[PDB]
Design a binder for this molecule. Sequence first.
Ligand SMILES: Nc1nc2c(ncn2[C@@H]2O[C@H](COP(=O)(O)OP(=O)(O)O)[C@@H](O)[C@H]2O)c(=O)[nH]1
Ligand SMILES: Nc1nc2c(ncn2[C@@H]2O[C@H](COP(=O)(O)OP(=O)(O)O)[C@@H](O)[C@H]2O)c(=O)[nH]1
Lengths: 171, 174
Amino acid sequence: NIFGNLLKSLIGKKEMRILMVGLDAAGKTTILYKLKLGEIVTTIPTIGFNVETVEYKNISFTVWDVGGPLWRHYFQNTQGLIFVVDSNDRERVNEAREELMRMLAEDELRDAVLLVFANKQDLPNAMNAAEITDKLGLHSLRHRNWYIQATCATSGDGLYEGLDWLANQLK
Amino acid sequence: NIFGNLLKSLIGKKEMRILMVGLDAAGKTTILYKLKLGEIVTTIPTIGFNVETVEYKNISFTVWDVGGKIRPLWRHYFQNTQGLIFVVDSNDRERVNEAREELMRMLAEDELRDAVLLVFANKQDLPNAMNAAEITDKLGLHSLRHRNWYIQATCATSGDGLYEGLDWLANQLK
Ligand SMILES: Nc1nc2c(ncn2[C@@H]2O[C@H](COP(=O)(O)OP(=O)(O)O)[C@@H](O)[C@H]2O)c(=O)[nH]1
Ligand SMILES: Nc1nc2c(ncn2[C@@H]2O[C@H](COP(=O)(O)OP(=O)(O)O)[C@@H](O)[C@H]2O)c(=O)[nH]1
């Protein structure tokens, strides 16, 4: 209930998309499943391009992996961008940084609010939120409304606080 | 829908359960999407265990990745399963032997003793793909002395070969 309750004010007619992306194995499917806002439906609109969507009324959460095109069609009604990083994966945090910056430079996403989930904080030497803020260069983002939330998606810790912040921004 | 028409001999009151498994990246989600038998729904029944499901009438297609142990929740799926589809990336010579081991561990599971096995040698459009005869030997299918099995070469992205294999599977499950 608590997640559907966050979107009560955004309920309406204009369909707004929340896009949640990050490297493979960051935790994005796990997060979608923890929202309990509807079934996770997988589509393949182009060969090689797997998309996961949960449609709750006029709000859609759309997920895909970034990291080593047709994406431009999704950006139109995208009001929020959630980037999920595996805070335990130090080998690939520089690649995450490169994919985040590549998303933020899309002109079709220039007015989008950015929520960063620093996920897998339960793991013994996960990087904390301040450290991920450094590795991702978030303080260098000067004209973006952003926020970083430390999370453990398997237990749900932090998901509500992150999404509460985001819904407030889209108000 | 050709695949809907193919499966019609199987429609009834009793829930037909087809399991499609394989190593990650074998092409299983692509196959499910190509069948056009309804939406692919992902659930996570237990931590770390992503299951994809397509429900067509009384027929359910369930998918998950193997590779890396048989859990008890797996055995529960096994108990109600009539067909096992094992999908192999035919171009992944590095991991074919792991695919063999995972298929053999499943087939030794007593809950699956009566299940019909269909192997998809997928990704045949790629130039170094192992053909069906080589996958047959790599996977040890001829050493299955009590199992009803069939192997079908496929290219799941074009959708070709899938009909022939499911045709065979449906006829066995009849
Ligand atoms: N330890 C830990 N594992 C997680 C967490 N979130 C997700 N996972 C695991 O990471 C793996 C991949 O997660 P998944 O949601 O499929 O990632 P995706 O590829 O981004 O969709 C699974 O084994 C999940 O259980 C977390 O906060 N802590
Ligand atoms: N060349 C080729 N690629 C394929 C084929 N089938 C699937 N793929 C691709 O292999 C990758 C994994 O496919 P997917 O269905 O997600 O694999 P899964 O992890 O088993 O679900 C994707 O990039 C697919 O587009 C095929 O017959 N040929």
